[PDB]
Write a protein that binds this ligand. Sequence first.
Ligand SMILES: O=C(COc1ccccc1P(=O)(O)O)Nc1cccc(Cl)c1
Ligand SMILES: O=C(COc1ccccc1P(=O)(O)O)Nc1cccc(Cl)c1
Ligand SMILES: [Cl-]
Ligand SMILES: [Cl-]
Ligand SMILES: [Cl-]
Ligand SMILES: [Cl-]
Ligand SMILES: [Mg+2]
Ligand SMILES: [Mg+2]
Ligand SMILES: [Mg+2]
Ligand SMILES: [Mg+2]
Ligand SMILES: [Mg+2]
Ligand SMILES: [Mg+2]
Ligand SMILES: [Mg+2]
Ligand SMILES: [Mg+2]
Ligand SMILES: [Mg+2]
Ligand SMILES: [Mg+2]
Lengths: 231, 231
Amino acid sequence: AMGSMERASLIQKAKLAEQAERYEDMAAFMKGAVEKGEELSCEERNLLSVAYKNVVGGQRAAWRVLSSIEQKSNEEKGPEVREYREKVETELQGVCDTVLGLLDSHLIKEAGDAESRVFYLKMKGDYYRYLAEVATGDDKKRIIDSARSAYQEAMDISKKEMPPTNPIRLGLALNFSVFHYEIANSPEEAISLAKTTFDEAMADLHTLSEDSYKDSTLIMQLLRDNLTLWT
Amino acid sequence: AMGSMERASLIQKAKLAEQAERYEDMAAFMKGAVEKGEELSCEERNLLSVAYKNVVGGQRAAWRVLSSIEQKSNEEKGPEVREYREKVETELQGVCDTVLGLLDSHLIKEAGDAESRVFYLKMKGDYYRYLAEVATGDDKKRIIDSARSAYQEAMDISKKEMPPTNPIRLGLALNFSVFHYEIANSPEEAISLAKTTFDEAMADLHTLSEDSYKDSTLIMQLLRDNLTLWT
Ligand SMILES: O=C(COc1ccccc1P(=O)(O)O)Nc1cccc(Cl)c1
Ligand SMILES: O=C(COc1ccccc1P(=O)(O)O)Nc1cccc(Cl)c1
Ligand SMILES: [Cl-]
Ligand SMILES: [Cl-]
Ligand SMILES: [Cl-]
Ligand SMILES: [Cl-]
Ligand SMILES: [Mg+2]
Ligand SMILES: [Mg+2]
Ligand SMILES: [Mg+2]
Ligand SMILES: [Mg+2]
Ligand SMILES: [Mg+2]
Ligand SMILES: [Mg+2]
Ligand SMILES: [Mg+2]
Ligand SMILES: [Mg+2]
Ligand SMILES: [Mg+2]
Ligand SMILES: [Mg+2]
């Protein structure tokens, strides 16, 4: 539906939608911009990420509420709780599949710089992770391994190509630690990764401007917040 | 799309959607329930109202953000702000027209008890009021008069048939005062209505149980909050 709108108009409208807190519209505008086929700038990658993280965040919150009610039900109240949890689940899967589709066609393959490639691979890890949260069985196993593989490729590039305080490197490590703790049943791997990431960023802070220091220390606090939750 | 689902399943899912904060789904489930053609109970009227008030509330908040940006623009940045404000405006009008359609087909005509009839006429006033907020010109005049007429019929019934502390009577008076202040350019009528409503409810509080007292005084505080904003 966005095929007739200029790329620059799609970007401008995504920024308007963000101001209006209209995140579904924001995601649709950014999907349209990606589908123009040009690479995204740093600012545009961030719009894409913010839009979808807010859309999927709404669905994840709802899915948790409904899953909890369903689990409690398990007086008979009929199929309705399961049906509606499934509806929300299907819509959530559809959003994840859309994002993964954009990454595969063709954002990741054209991303040559470390900052873009790590950003997109982290996104690939995150959206497979959201799929894993609602998956069951071995179906679940291949999804978990897809998330793992994407995060691992991102980490390998980030460690070779970015400083330990780079915010995208920090955010990737934070989310991969969350993957280990919440999805992969590997709380020790989670704690080790978050601690090493934190310590290596601390040792690099002296190299940063006031503004970069603020950006890095904000994400380090998130790693610290998790380490406090986990230990 | 809800034609194949049982009425009771639609109601149950509306309550689930409210818990999950999925207000668009909640409105769709309640629209489906109304379209079954049976009258709504007090609890079901309240679900219908909560659902649509949240949906339209999101649109009104967005429309205000975009209208403000548009008015500021009036460097040339092209048609995009106007286009996107119009998109949001159209969707908002569509929601209002949907609610008004449900009231006209056939909720109001089958509502014989005071509590149902006043509730639906208040809703008719509110949704024409939301249409008036985005309307221009004389188009605007007939919309304002539709809101007025609906509120006036509701007030006439409420004054004849309900005690001055009845929460629906109180809410109707609050919203009609807001209509006078914000839409009809009649701040004196707004202040007079809110003050008389407040004073007449205060004099009736002695007749109420602890629980009814809590329900009434909560809405009286809203009338007081507006009177403080307006004087
Ligand atoms: O509360 C959280 C915290 O999740 C994180 C914490 C640190 C890094 C990354 C995440 P996330 O990508 O799972 O959102 N996420 C969340 C976000 C939106 C909806 C719901 Cl239900 C949960
Ligand atoms: O802030 C308000 C206050 O409006 C009222 C105050 C007292 C009674 C009735 C109303 P409302 O029916 O205009 O929401 N409403 C509002 C509700 C949702 C979105 C936006 Cl932008 C505004
Ligand atoms: Cl459903
Ligand atoms: Cl490449
Ligand atoms: Cl638009
Ligand atoms: Cl009747
Ligand atoms: Mg072009
Ligand atoms: Mg049932
Ligand atoms: Mg399923
Ligand atoms: Mg390239
Ligand atoms: Mg480098
Ligand atoms: Mg039936
Ligand atoms: Mg422009
Ligand atoms: Mg218009
Ligand atoms: Mg009747
Ligand atoms: Mg009576």
